[PDB]
Ligand binder design. Structure first.
Ligand SMILES: Nc1ncnc2c1ncn2[C@@H]1O[C@H](COP(=O)(O)OP(=O)(O)OP(=O)(O)OP(=O)(O)OP(=O)(O)OC[C@H]2O[C@@H](n3cnc4c(N)ncnc43)[C@H](O)[C@@H]2O)[C@@H](O)[C@H]1O
Ligand SMILES: [Mg+2]
Ligand SMILES: [Zn+2]
Length: 217
């Protein structure tokens, strides 16, 4: 299963990714994760990226496409993969089509997790993620068993620097602007599918699973 998740910041892409990866054992490729790792490690790309992320802006396309091209070629992606929050622009999506054509791993479905903007500030400011394994929690909607401790590795949870009210408002604007063109791109391709992301996380996952059920695992 060769999959893309798309959706606004806070829509639940990571939360569903965790469940898809657990159930199907495919690699999770998250450009935000990659950029945050590089930033933590202090690499030149991480430091460049940090500037955009801190503002809530997108990292430029070509560097982003580069890291994805490199990632997607690995042997662990032979039996499927899950792209989470890439592509984010039409240019990214056009480059991805070429990339997948070259290695013979074309997309099965793009899954649009649809959430209205007026619930996303509360989703993002109460988001808490594990420092070690990146497991996602929410202080209201999905708290850990023990406060501040990841249920999966027992790591400490933290608040992403970009999940602050001002940067959230920028991220929503910047990504909303990219959405209609990117949705139209894939709608024209024919394999865009929508999932209502304003349901309990389990019900959202049920809808995702039922869509994936036509694919080989
Ligand atoms: N391709 C690209 N090109 C250019 N730049 C790029 C790029 N990719 C990354 N970047 C750069 O990197 C930055 C960060 O990218 P990124 O890390 O991808 O952050 P984002 O794009 O801001 O998306 P999030 O990861 O913010 O949201 P999500 O949809 O995963 O939601 P979650 O499941 O966590 O859920 C949110 C919260 O709500 C909760 N929740 C989840 N589902 C539900 C539900 N059904 N009900 C209630 N609460 C829920 C969760 O527990 C959690 O607390 C970008 O801003 C940009 O600078
Ligand atoms: Mg994410
Ligand atoms: Zn953890």
């Amino acid at each position: 299963m060769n999959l893309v998740l798309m959706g606004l910041p806070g829509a639940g892409k990571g939360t569903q990714a965790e469940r898809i990866v657990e159930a199907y054992g495919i690699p999770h490729i998250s450009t935000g994760d990659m950029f945050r790792a590089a930033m933590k490690e202090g690499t030149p790309l991480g430091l460049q990226a940090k500037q955009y992320m801190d503002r809530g802006d997108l990292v430029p396309d070509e560097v982003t496409i580069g890291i994805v091209r490199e990632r997607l070629g690995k042997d662990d992606c032979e039996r499927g993969f899950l792209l989470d929050g890439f592509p984010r622009t039409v240019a990214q999506a056009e480059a991805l089509e070429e990339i997948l054509e070259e290695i013979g791993r074309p997309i099965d479905y793009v899954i649009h997790i649809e959430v209205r903007q007026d619930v996303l500030m509360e989703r993002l400011t109460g988001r808490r993620i594990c420092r070690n394994c990146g497991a996602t929690y929410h202080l209201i909607f999905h708290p850990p068993a023990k406060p501040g401790v990841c249920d999966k590795c027992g790591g400490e949870l933290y608040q992403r620097a970009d999940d602050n009210e001002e940067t959230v408002a920028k991220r929503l604007e910047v990504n909303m602007k990219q959405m209609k063109p990117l949705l139209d791109f894939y709608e024209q391709k024919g394999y865009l599918r929508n999932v209502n992301g304003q349901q309990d996380m389990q019900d959202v996952f049920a809808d995702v699973r039922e869509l994936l059920g036509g694919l080989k695992r």
